[PDB]
PDB file of all heavy atoms in Angstrom:
ATOM      1  N   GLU K  15     -18.493  20.836 -12.803  1.00 15.91           N
ATOM      2  CA  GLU K  15     -19.247  20.810 -14.058  1.00 15.91           C
ATOM      3  C   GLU K  15     -19.759  22.218 -14.426  1.00 15.91           C
ATOM      4  O   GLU K  15     -19.750  22.622 -15.596  1.00 15.91           O
ATOM      5  CB  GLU K  15     -20.460  19.880 -13.938  1.00 15.91           C
ATOM      6  CG  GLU K  15     -20.115  18.397 -14.160  1.00 15.91           C
ATOM      7  CD  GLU K  15     -21.340  17.583 -14.554  1.00 15.91           C
ATOM      8  OE1 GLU K  15     -22.465  18.108 -14.508  1.00 15.91           O
ATOM      9  OE2 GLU K  15     -21.169  16.390 -14.915  1.00 15.91           O
ATOM     10  N   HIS K  39     -17.821  18.893 -29.752  1.00 20.31           N
ATOM     11  CA  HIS K  39     -17.829  20.198 -29.082  1.00 20.31           C
ATOM     12  C   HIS K  39     -16.943  20.144 -27.831  1.00 20.31           C
ATOM     13  O   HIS K  39     -17.342  19.625 -26.806  1.00 20.31           O
ATOM     14  CB  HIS K  39     -19.244  20.596 -28.663  1.00 20.31           C
ATOM     15  CG  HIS K  39     -20.188  20.762 -29.825  1.00 20.31           C
ATOM     16  ND1 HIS K  39     -20.845  19.681 -30.382  1.00 20.31           N
ATOM     17  CD2 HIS K  39     -20.530  21.840 -30.551  1.00 20.31           C
ATOM     18  CE1 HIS K  39     -21.564  20.116 -31.410  1.00 20.31           C
ATOM     19  NE2 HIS K  39     -21.387  21.401 -31.543  1.00 20.31           N
ATOM     20  N   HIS K 109     -16.452  13.834 -23.078  1.00 18.84           N
ATOM     21  CA  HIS K 109     -15.286  13.489 -23.898  1.00 18.84           C
ATOM     22  C   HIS K 109     -14.205  12.778 -23.122  1.00 18.84           C
ATOM     23  O   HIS K 109     -13.118  12.536 -23.625  1.00 18.84           O
ATOM     24  CB  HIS K 109     -14.655  14.759 -24.498  1.00 18.84           C
ATOM     25  CG  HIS K 109     -15.484  15.350 -25.622  1.00 18.84           C
ATOM     26  ND1 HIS K 109     -15.038  16.438 -26.345  1.00 18.84           N
ATOM     27  CD2 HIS K 109     -16.707  15.060 -26.074  1.00 18.84           C
ATOM     28  CE1 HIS K 109     -15.999  16.766 -27.207  1.00 18.84           C
ATOM     29  NE2 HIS K 109     -16.989  15.944 -27.070  1.00 18.84           N
ATOM     30  N   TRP K 112     -12.368   6.956 -17.772  1.00 24.56           N
ATOM     31  CA  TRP K 112     -11.430   6.601 -16.674  1.00 24.56           C
ATOM     32  C   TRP K 112     -10.880   5.203 -16.911  1.00 24.56           C
ATOM     33  O   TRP K 112     -11.581   4.219 -16.722  1.00 24.56           O
ATOM     34  CB  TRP K 112     -12.240   6.637 -15.357  1.00 24.56           C
ATOM     35  CG  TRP K 112     -11.487   6.774 -14.046  1.00 24.56           C
ATOM     36  CD1 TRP K 112     -11.650   6.004 -12.930  1.00 24.56           C
ATOM     37  CD2 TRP K 112     -10.524   7.769 -13.688  1.00 24.56           C
ATOM     38  NE1 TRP K 112     -10.896   6.486 -11.897  1.00 24.56           N
ATOM     39  CE2 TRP K 112     -10.192   7.567 -12.339  1.00 24.56           C
ATOM     40  CE3 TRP K 112      -9.933   8.867 -14.394  1.00 24.56           C
ATOM     41  CZ2 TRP K 112      -9.266   8.393 -11.661  1.00 24.56           C
ATOM     42  CZ3 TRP K 112      -9.045   9.637 -13.718  1.00 24.56           C
ATOM     43  CH2 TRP K 112      -8.718   9.420 -12.366  1.00 24.56           C
ATOM     44  N   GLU K 113      -9.583   5.151 -17.297  1.00 25.26           N
ATOM     45  CA  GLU K 113      -8.932   3.861 -17.617  1.00 25.26           C
ATOM     46  C   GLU K 113      -7.417   3.959 -17.490  1.00 25.26           C
ATOM     47  O   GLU K 113      -6.840   5.054 -17.366  1.00 25.26           O
ATOM     48  CB  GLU K 113      -9.283   3.463 -19.055  1.00 25.26           C
ATOM     49  CG  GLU K 113      -8.731   4.404 -20.112  1.00 25.26           C
ATOM     50  CD  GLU K 113      -9.412   4.280 -21.468  1.00 25.26           C
ATOM     51  OE1 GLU K 113     -10.285   3.411 -21.620  1.00 25.26           O
ATOM     52  OE2 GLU K 113      -9.070   5.108 -22.357  1.00 25.26           O
ATOM     53  N   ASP K 117      -4.581   1.670 -21.967  1.00 16.91           N
ATOM     54  CA  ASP K 117      -5.878   1.744 -22.685  1.00 16.91           C
ATOM     55  C   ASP K 117      -6.032   3.155 -23.298  1.00 16.91           C
ATOM     56  O   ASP K 117      -6.558   3.309 -24.396  1.00 16.91           O
ATOM     57  CB  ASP K 117      -7.036   1.477 -21.726  1.00 16.91           C
ATOM     58  CG  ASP K 117      -7.255   0.020 -21.409  1.00 16.91           C
ATOM     59  OD1 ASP K 117      -6.654  -0.820 -22.101  1.00 16.91           O
ATOM     60  OD2 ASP K 117      -8.014  -0.301 -20.492  1.00 16.91           O
ATOM     61  N   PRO K 146      -1.541   3.459 -42.007  1.00 18.58           N
ATOM     62  CA  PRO K 146      -0.463   2.559 -42.478  1.00 18.58           C
ATOM     63  C   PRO K 146       0.911   2.698 -41.831  1.00 18.58           C
ATOM     64  O   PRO K 146       1.738   1.798 -41.857  1.00 18.58           O
ATOM     65  CB  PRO K 146      -0.396   2.823 -43.980  1.00 18.58           C
ATOM     66  CG  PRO K 146      -1.629   3.562 -44.338  1.00 18.58           C
ATOM     67  CD  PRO K 146      -2.040   4.320 -43.082  1.00 18.58           C
ATOM     68  N   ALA K 148       4.688   4.793 -41.312  1.00 15.56           N
ATOM     69  CA  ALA K 148       5.724   5.312 -42.214  1.00 15.56           C
ATOM     70  C   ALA K 148       6.977   4.462 -42.224  1.00 15.56           C
ATOM     71  O   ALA K 148       8.085   4.921 -42.514  1.00 15.56           O
ATOM     72  CB  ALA K 148       6.066   6.744 -41.858  1.00 15.56           C
ATOM     73  N   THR K 149       6.831   3.200 -41.842  1.00 13.25           N
ATOM     74  CA  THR K 149       7.903   2.235 -41.763  1.00 13.25           C
ATOM     75  C   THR K 149       8.916   2.410 -42.890  1.00 13.25           C
ATOM     76  O   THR K 149       8.538   2.403 -44.054  1.00 13.25           O
ATOM     77  CB  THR K 149       7.349   0.816 -41.755  1.00 13.25           C
ATOM     78  OG1 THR K 149       6.262   0.765 -40.814  1.00 13.25           O
ATOM     79  CG2 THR K 149       8.406  -0.193 -41.414  1.00 13.25           C
ATOM     80  N   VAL K 150      10.217   2.549 -42.564  1.00 11.58           N
ATOM     81  CA  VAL K 150      11.220   2.717 -43.589  1.00 11.58           C
ATOM     82  C   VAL K 150      11.803   1.415 -44.145  1.00 11.58           C
ATOM     83  O   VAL K 150      12.295   1.414 -45.289  1.00 11.58           O
ATOM     84  CB  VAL K 150      12.403   3.667 -43.123  1.00 11.58           C
ATOM     85  CG1 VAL K 150      11.999   4.364 -41.838  1.00 11.58           C
ATOM     86  CG2 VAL K 150      13.720   2.890 -42.966  1.00 11.58           C
ATOM     87  N   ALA K 151      11.760   0.334 -43.389  1.00 13.51           N
ATOM     88  CA  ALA K 151      12.261  -0.969 -43.866  1.00 13.51           C
ATOM     89  C   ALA K 151      11.585  -2.151 -43.182  1.00 13.51           C
ATOM     90  O   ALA K 151      11.488  -2.143 -41.927  1.00 13.51           O
ATOM     91  CB  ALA K 151      13.788  -1.013 -43.670  1.00 13.51           C
ATOM     92  N   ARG K 156      19.588 -11.540 -45.690  1.00 13.15           N
ATOM     93  CA  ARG K 156      20.442 -11.663 -46.858  1.00 13.15           C
ATOM     94  C   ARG K 156      20.706 -13.112 -47.191  1.00 13.15           C
ATOM     95  O   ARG K 156      20.826 -13.471 -48.333  1.00 13.15           O
ATOM     96  CB  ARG K 156      21.756 -10.921 -46.620  1.00 13.15           C
ATOM     97  CG  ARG K 156      21.655  -9.436 -47.008  1.00 13.15           C
ATOM     98  CD  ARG K 156      22.875  -8.632 -46.591  1.00 13.15           C
ATOM     99  NE  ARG K 156      24.146  -9.284 -46.993  1.00 13.15           N
ATOM    100  CZ  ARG K 156      24.620  -9.250 -48.200  1.00 13.15           C
ATOM    101  NH1 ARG K 156      23.997  -8.593 -49.177  1.00 13.15           N
ATOM    102  NH2 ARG K 156      25.774  -9.852 -48.492  1.00 13.15           N
ATOM    103  N   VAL K 162      10.079 -17.376 -40.692  1.00 15.83           N
ATOM    104  CA  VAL K 162       9.251 -16.616 -39.751  1.00 15.83           C
ATOM    105  C   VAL K 162       8.726 -17.536 -38.656  1.00 15.83           C
ATOM    106  O   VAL K 162       8.466 -16.990 -37.519  1.00 15.83           O
ATOM    107  CB  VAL K 162       7.993 -15.976 -40.413  1.00 15.83           C
ATOM    108  CG1 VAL K 162       8.165 -14.488 -40.538  1.00 15.83           C
ATOM    109  CG2 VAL K 162       7.698 -16.610 -41.735  1.00 15.83           C
TER     110      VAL K 162
ATOM    111  N   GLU X  15      23.900 -12.330 -38.959  1.00 25.12           N
ATOM    112  CA  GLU X  15      22.885 -13.282 -39.367  1.00 25.12           C
ATOM    113  C   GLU X  15      23.268 -14.707 -39.012  1.00 25.12           C
ATOM    114  O   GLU X  15      22.418 -15.481 -38.533  1.00 25.12           O
ATOM    115  CB  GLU X  15      22.595 -13.173 -40.867  1.00 25.12           C
ATOM    116  CG  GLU X  15      21.630 -12.080 -41.240  1.00 25.12           C
ATOM    117  CD  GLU X  15      21.153 -12.151 -42.682  1.00 25.12           C
ATOM    118  OE1 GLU X  15      21.447 -13.171 -43.376  1.00 25.12           O
ATOM    119  OE2 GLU X  15      20.509 -11.215 -43.141  1.00 25.12           O
ATOM    120  N   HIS X  39       8.473 -18.329 -35.233  1.00 16.68           N
ATOM    121  CA  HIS X  39       9.725 -18.962 -34.772  1.00 16.68           C
ATOM    122  C   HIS X  39      10.679 -17.805 -34.401  1.00 16.68           C
ATOM    123  O   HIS X  39      11.295 -17.215 -35.250  1.00 16.68           O
ATOM    124  CB  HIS X  39      10.323 -19.818 -35.856  1.00 16.68           C
ATOM    125  CG  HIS X  39       9.422 -20.917 -36.309  1.00 16.68           C
ATOM    126  ND1 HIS X  39       8.547 -20.796 -37.368  1.00 16.68           N
ATOM    127  CD2 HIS X  39       9.220 -22.145 -35.780  1.00 16.68           C
ATOM    128  CE1 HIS X  39       7.848 -21.878 -37.464  1.00 16.68           C
ATOM    129  NE2 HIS X  39       8.205 -22.726 -36.516  1.00 16.68           N
ATOM    130  N   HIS X 109      11.399 -10.951 -38.139  1.00  2.00           N
ATOM    131  CA  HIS X 109      10.442 -10.473 -37.119  1.00  2.00           C
ATOM    132  C   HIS X 109      10.694  -9.027 -36.752  1.00  2.00           C
ATOM    133  O   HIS X 109      10.116  -8.499 -35.802  1.00  2.00           O
ATOM    134  CB  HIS X 109      10.552 -11.353 -35.871  1.00  2.00           C
ATOM    135  CG  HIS X 109       9.964 -12.704 -35.982  1.00  2.00           C
ATOM    136  ND1 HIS X 109       9.767 -13.549 -34.932  1.00  2.00           N
ATOM    137  CD2 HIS X 109       9.545 -13.383 -37.089  1.00  2.00           C
ATOM    138  CE1 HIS X 109       9.261 -14.690 -35.365  1.00  2.00           C
ATOM    139  NE2 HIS X 109       9.090 -14.615 -36.675  1.00  2.00           N
ATOM    140  N   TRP X 112      12.093  -1.524 -39.444  1.00  2.00           N
ATOM    141  CA  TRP X 112      12.783  -0.279 -39.090  1.00  2.00           C
ATOM    142  C   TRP X 112      11.763   0.842 -39.193  1.00  2.00           C
ATOM    143  O   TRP X 112      11.311   1.203 -40.278  1.00  2.00           O
ATOM    144  CB  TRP X 112      13.933  -0.088 -40.094  1.00  2.00           C
ATOM    145  CG  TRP X 112      15.049   0.846 -39.717  1.00  2.00           C
ATOM    146  CD1 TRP X 112      15.569   1.852 -40.473  1.00  2.00           C
ATOM    147  CD2 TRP X 112      15.850   0.827 -38.517  1.00  2.00           C
ATOM    148  NE1 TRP X 112      16.604   2.451 -39.850  1.00  2.00           N
ATOM    149  CE2 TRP X 112      16.823   1.844 -38.635  1.00  2.00           C
ATOM    150  CE3 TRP X 112      15.804   0.056 -37.336  1.00  2.00           C
ATOM    151  CZ2 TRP X 112      17.752   2.099 -37.655  1.00  2.00           C
ATOM    152  CZ3 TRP X 112      16.773   0.309 -36.329  1.00  2.00           C
ATOM    153  CH2 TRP X 112      17.727   1.330 -36.513  1.00  2.00           C
ATOM    154  N   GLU X 113      11.398   1.441 -38.039  1.00  2.00           N
ATOM    155  CA  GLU X 113      10.409   2.511 -38.028  1.00  2.00           C
ATOM    156  C   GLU X 113      10.488   3.410 -36.790  1.00  2.00           C
ATOM    157  O   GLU X 113      11.204   3.126 -35.841  1.00  2.00           O
ATOM    158  CB  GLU X 113       9.023   1.877 -38.129  1.00  2.00           C
ATOM    159  CG  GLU X 113       8.697   0.952 -36.955  1.00  2.00           C
ATOM    160  CD  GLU X 113       7.424   0.133 -37.180  1.00  2.00           C
ATOM    161  OE1 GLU X 113       6.809   0.297 -38.249  1.00  2.00           O
ATOM    162  OE2 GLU X 113       7.037  -0.608 -36.253  1.00  2.00           O
ATOM    163  N   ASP X 117       5.249   4.467 -34.644  1.00  2.00           N
ATOM    164  CA  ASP X 117       4.809   3.342 -35.457  1.00  2.00           C
ATOM    165  C   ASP X 117       5.019   2.062 -34.660  1.00  2.00           C
ATOM    166  O   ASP X 117       4.162   1.150 -34.695  1.00  2.00           O
ATOM    167  CB  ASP X 117       5.606   3.281 -36.783  1.00  2.00           C
ATOM    168  CG  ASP X 117       5.089   4.264 -37.787  1.00  2.00           C
ATOM    169  OD1 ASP X 117       4.072   4.932 -37.517  1.00  2.00           O
ATOM    170  OD2 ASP X 117       5.723   4.395 -38.865  1.00  2.00           O
ATOM    171  N   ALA X 134       1.498  -0.517 -43.412  1.00 12.29           N
ATOM    172  CA  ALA X 134       2.110  -0.713 -44.722  1.00 12.29           C
ATOM    173  C   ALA X 134       2.960  -1.970 -44.668  1.00 12.29           C
ATOM    174  O   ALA X 134       2.901  -2.819 -45.571  1.00 12.29           O
ATOM    175  CB  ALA X 134       2.950   0.473 -45.092  1.00 12.29           C
ATOM    176  N   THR X 149     -12.027  -0.192 -19.138  1.00 19.50           N
ATOM    177  CA  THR X 149     -12.445   1.171 -18.783  1.00 19.50           C
ATOM    178  C   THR X 149     -13.395   1.170 -17.581  1.00 19.50           C
ATOM    179  O   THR X 149     -14.484   0.629 -17.665  1.00 19.50           O
ATOM    180  CB  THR X 149     -13.087   1.873 -19.993  1.00 19.50           C
ATOM    181  OG1 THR X 149     -12.238   1.764 -21.114  1.00 19.50           O
ATOM    182  CG2 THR X 149     -13.376   3.326 -19.647  1.00 19.50           C
ATOM    183  N   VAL X 150     -12.940   1.788 -16.503  1.00 20.70           N
ATOM    184  CA  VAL X 150     -13.733   1.855 -15.270  1.00 20.70           C
ATOM    185  C   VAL X 150     -15.000   2.665 -15.449  1.00 20.70           C
ATOM    186  O   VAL X 150     -16.077   2.271 -15.017  1.00 20.70           O
ATOM    187  CB  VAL X 150     -12.912   2.382 -14.101  1.00 20.70           C
ATOM    188  CG1 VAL X 150     -13.792   2.718 -12.887  1.00 20.70           C
ATOM    189  CG2 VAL X 150     -11.845   1.394 -13.708  1.00 20.70           C
ATOM    190  N   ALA X 151     -14.870   3.839 -16.086  1.00 23.95           N
ATOM    191  CA  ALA X 151     -16.023   4.696 -16.274  1.00 23.95           C
ATOM    192  C   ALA X 151     -15.907   5.445 -17.603  1.00 23.95           C
ATOM    193  O   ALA X 151     -14.838   5.871 -18.013  1.00 23.95           O
ATOM    194  CB  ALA X 151     -16.114   5.730 -15.121  1.00 23.95           C
ATOM    195  N   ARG X 156     -23.592  15.077 -15.269  1.00 25.19           N
ATOM    196  CA  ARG X 156     -24.700  15.036 -14.326  1.00 25.19           C
ATOM    197  C   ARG X 156     -25.840  15.983 -14.745  1.00 25.19           C
ATOM    198  O   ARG X 156     -26.997  15.554 -14.896  1.00 25.19           O
ATOM    199  CB  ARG X 156     -24.172  15.346 -12.907  1.00 25.19           C
ATOM    200  CG  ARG X 156     -23.165  14.303 -12.455  1.00 25.19           C
ATOM    201  CD  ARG X 156     -22.394  14.742 -11.228  1.00 25.19           C
ATOM    202  NE  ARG X 156     -23.268  14.919 -10.049  1.00 25.19           N
ATOM    203  CZ  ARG X 156     -23.804  13.911  -9.357  1.00 25.19           C
ATOM    204  NH1 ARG X 156     -23.530  12.648  -9.652  1.00 25.19           N
ATOM    205  NH2 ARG X 156     -24.607  14.175  -8.339  1.00 25.19           N
ATOM    206  N   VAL X 162     -21.992  16.552 -26.666  1.00 27.03           N
ATOM    207  CA  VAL X 162     -20.779  15.887 -27.205  1.00 27.03           C
ATOM    208  C   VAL X 162     -20.166  16.751 -28.306  1.00 27.03           C
ATOM    209  O   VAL X 162     -18.922  16.746 -28.451  1.00 27.03           O
ATOM    210  CB  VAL X 162     -21.080  14.484 -27.772  1.00 27.03           C
ATOM    211  CG1 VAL X 162     -21.435  13.528 -26.641  1.00 27.03           C
ATOM    212  CG2 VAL X 162     -22.187  14.572 -28.781  1.00 27.03           C
TER     213      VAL X 162
END
Side-chain angles (χ1 to χ4, degrees):
Chain K
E15 278 202 352
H39 298 84
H109 287 185
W112 200 228
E113 66 199 355
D117 281 348
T149 312
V150 348
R156 273 171 49 79
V162 252
Chain X
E15 278 192 7
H39 301 92
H109 286 190
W112 199 229
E113 60 190 4
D117 281 355
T149 307
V150 169
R156 297 166 64 75
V162 290

